Design an enzyme around this catalytic site. Structure first.
Site, mmCIF file in Angstrom:
data_model
loop_
_atom_site.group_PDB
_atom_site.id
_atom_site.type_symbol
_atom_site.label_atom_id
_atom_site.label_comp_id
_atom_site.label_asym_id
_atom_site.label_seq_id
_atom_site.Cartn_x
_atom_site.Cartn_y
_atom_site.Cartn_z
ATOM 1 N N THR C 27 -22.234 16.105 41.709
ATOM 2 C CA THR C 27 -22.424 16.285 43.145
ATOM 3 C C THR C 27 -23.568 17.237 43.384
ATOM 4 O OG1 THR C 27 -20.074 15.872 43.545
ATOM 5 C CG2 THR C 27 -21.251 16.978 45.338
ATOM 6 N N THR C 30 -29.466 17.557 42.770
ATOM 7 C CA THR C 30 -29.966 17.216 41.422
ATOM 8 C C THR C 30 -29.148 16.044 40.839
ATOM 9 O OG1 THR C 30 -30.554 19.587 41.180
ATOM 10 C CG2 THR C 30 -30.712 18.155 39.210
ATOM 11 N N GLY C 83 -24.641 19.178 38.582
ATOM 12 C CA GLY C 83 -25.448 20.339 38.890
ATOM 13 C C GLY C 83 -24.704 21.645 38.876
ATOM 14 N N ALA C 84 -25.435 22.698 39.220
ATOM 15 C CA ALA C 84 -24.917 24.055 39.291
ATOM 16 C C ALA C 84 -25.641 24.893 40.339
ATOM 17 C CB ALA C 84 -25.026 24.773 37.898
ATOM 18 N N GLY C 98 -21.041 25.373 45.614
ATOM 19 C CA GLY C 98 -21.841 25.551 46.807
ATOM 20 C C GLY C 98 -21.655 24.398 47.809
ATOM 21 N N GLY C 99 -21.562 23.168 47.295
ATOM 22 C CA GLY C 99 -21.319 21.978 48.094
ATOM 23 C C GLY C 99 -19.859 21.634 48.317
ATOM 24 N N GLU C 105 -15.035 18.193 40.515
ATOM 25 C CA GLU C 105 -16.061 18.410 39.483
ATOM 26 C C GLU C 105 -15.472 18.982 38.190
ATOM 27 O OE1 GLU C 105 -18.842 20.939 41.489
ATOM 28 O OE2 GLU C 105 -19.458 19.332 42.867
HETATM 29 CL CL LIG Z 1 -20.110 21.309 44.952
#
Ligand SMILES: [Cl-]
Ligand SMILES: [Cl-]
Ligand SMILES: [Cl-]
Ligand SMILES: [Cl-]
Lengths: 225, 225, 225, 225
Positions: C27, C30, C83-84, C98-99, C105
């Site tokens: 997610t 990236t 991503g990260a 963050g999202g 995840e």
């Molecule tokens: Cl996220």
């Protein structure tokens, strides 16, 4: 965004509250001003008034302004106050759900003894749904097939995406929101038809309003059928 | 309980599946037997067939019988197979949701290219809803007001309570179930009206079906129209 | 926002995919670029590759780029790509969420045979959590008592609010998100302690990874251990 | 099933309530008797006491016995009363979640100023988890990988199926329940380790009780320390 008119209608609306009432607390910027006025008026006049929230937002605001909270499973509502994204002039039909909370809003608002809508004058429209899409809360497994059904009905339907989460916005109830532009001929019938699509939980067309308070430059006009 | 008739219908139904199809996997005892037959057929004939589940039950059984699962959000269903609590003889209208999964069932079954109901002969009825209540999935905050609306429509409505969890039975979607006995005059219209009650997600009246396979002592009959 | 470096890592990452694999679809921006590269490769090379999504975002992108989706409840993941928000340089511990999608995840990423993080160089940090708060998914009924717990642990915790739906941001699982700034002195233990606060579903500290691909101006570097 | 013993503990427990308190309302047969006693005491002595429920059951019972309800997000709990499936004699560690409500129970019970458990004598055991599995609440997408993780830990883990719905029992929070038999060597550590499995929300091991009131043929005895 017409804040002075919003505040004007909030201050007038709060006069309708009577000691001993259970009040539905709506969602959106106009409701939020009303919740602050109610909180003030409860404190300053030592009223016994309980609130039923239509969202996590309304619940959190009520708490901030120290309005005792109850639930619809426990109490009926005397007066539900709520905002609207559009109010159709001749019918007082609404579109609601710009804030993604139309489902719990409808549950409270349609069940209240009286449902009062609070808007600034910019919310009035000649034709419902001409310039605002209808929000539709959808079971996540059904998003594709609901988009299909809404498209079959003549609508342009798009999934509402988040700003502070990746992907689809999720409601307080764990579902997605599809916004659909439609040419609404018969709003009562369209509300019924959209709800009968498998996967649709509720939609933002409201057709049961007792009265509308409109903040205008002149004051607050009341609309009623 | 008619296990013999249920097995017979499942064995006959599985013959309708063609290589390359996406098959809707129903819920309940009869659909369970079908899932077993389908898994066995996929294995013994090396078919490339995918499934889309109507429930966590269907998902678990598909796992158990090695049927690859995809999602309705990506694939349409060629044939959906599912059970029913009642099949009305003249109309082929159904009641479903005895097992609490009617919402996801309807999402899959109404959207399938072909929706095939599997029942033993005992499920056939002269009048829909005379002897079985209508399951209604309800937003938990709305259960009291939905019970009121259903009662005001003439129904005898009761919240379904659980045995392996304390309190209300919770659906695969996180909602409550009310079961309501009604005098069903017009099933198509009642389905519509129940769904338009705020807080109602979906109900167990099904009025769209392609065919009904019925297990009888002399074999499987196919009802359609 | 380093789109060249994100595209570069996505293009290199997709080379790791082998015919027949089940791939975890991450997610964020990236990951989204990787999903597009993967879909392109599956098409242009006629690969038999399945995806397992980490979010409704990943589901929708997989639909768009024609990646067939299966379920973790049925299949293990060969390689998960995600991503990260931060990658700590010395340990390769991450912050994700963050999202708002860290729970699903982590479910996919920790269980994959190989978990590959995709980032641009700007995500590398000297000290985990110095400049980015830890996302914490919280049962809604618990947000106040979780804020208290995290505060006892020395965190500054705040409920994440949204603008595309009024009020708290709701995750793909129907829960709230609290973001908390902490001075992280043992990430592995902090991750474990946060998860043992009643009402916490999952948090965004990730302490298991196979390798991190980093897009830099001079090419894609691979970090491990 | 020890009904008179449950009643006698409930009657003794209710004496511990003082005017002005906020009380945690547990889940299960013994707690339900307590809720009845509390409702009676509030009415008869005109107490100003509020309840915070640990389940939809407890909320429904409170409403029936006219106990005013508040939420943990608004108020702290003075005393939480709850039942238990097992109480280990020497440690007062518990297993809870037989009724599928352990997550909300732990949120309330661990956060109370005082946590009081109510049991009949048959709930006392020499060794926690010898004869009763640990309930585990699990994100539905994670059931296979959580079964795997629990099995790797030495557990015998099985999905709990419903009897008034088909397939997995679903909690008040919309998640599954896996029951796992384990040889519990260190309860405090096991509780922590189970909670740190991705996809696990909360588990039924409780290690923070203040006192346990036990109904015996002779009377009610308080176990503490
Ligand atoms: Cl996220
Ligand atoms: Cl809204
Ligand atoms: Cl069912
Ligand atoms: Cl329980």
């Amino acid at each position: 965004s017409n804040e002075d008119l919003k505040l004007k209608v909030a201050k007038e609306a709060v006069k309708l509250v009577k000691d001993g009432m259970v009040i539905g607390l709506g969602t959106g910027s106009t409701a939020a001003l009303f919740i602050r006025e109610l909180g003030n008026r409860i404190r300053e006049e030592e009223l016994t008034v309980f609130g039923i929230p239509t969202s996590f937002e309304a619940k959190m605001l009520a708490m901030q302004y120290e309005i005792p909270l109850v639930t619809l499973d426990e109490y009926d509502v005397d007066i539900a106050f709520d905002g609207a994204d559009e109010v159709e002039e001749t019918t007082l039909f609404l579109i609601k759900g710009g804030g993604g909370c139309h489902t719990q809003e409808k549950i409270v608002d349609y069940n209240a003894n009286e449902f009062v809508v609070l808007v600034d004058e910019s919310k009035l429209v000649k034709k419902l749904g001409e310039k605002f899409p209808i929000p539709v809360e959808v079971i996540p497994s059904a998003y594709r097939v609901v988009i299909r059904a809404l498209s079959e009905m003549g609508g342009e339907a798009v999934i509402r995406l988040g700003d502070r989460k990746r992907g689809p916005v999720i409601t307080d109830n764990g579902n997605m929101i599809i916004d659909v532009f439609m040419n609404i001929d018969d709003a009562i019938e369209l509300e019924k038809e959209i709800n009968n699509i498998p996967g649709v939980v509720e939609n933002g067309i409201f057709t049961k309003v007792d009265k509308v308070l409109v903040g205008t430059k002149k004051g607050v006009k009341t609309l009623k059928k």
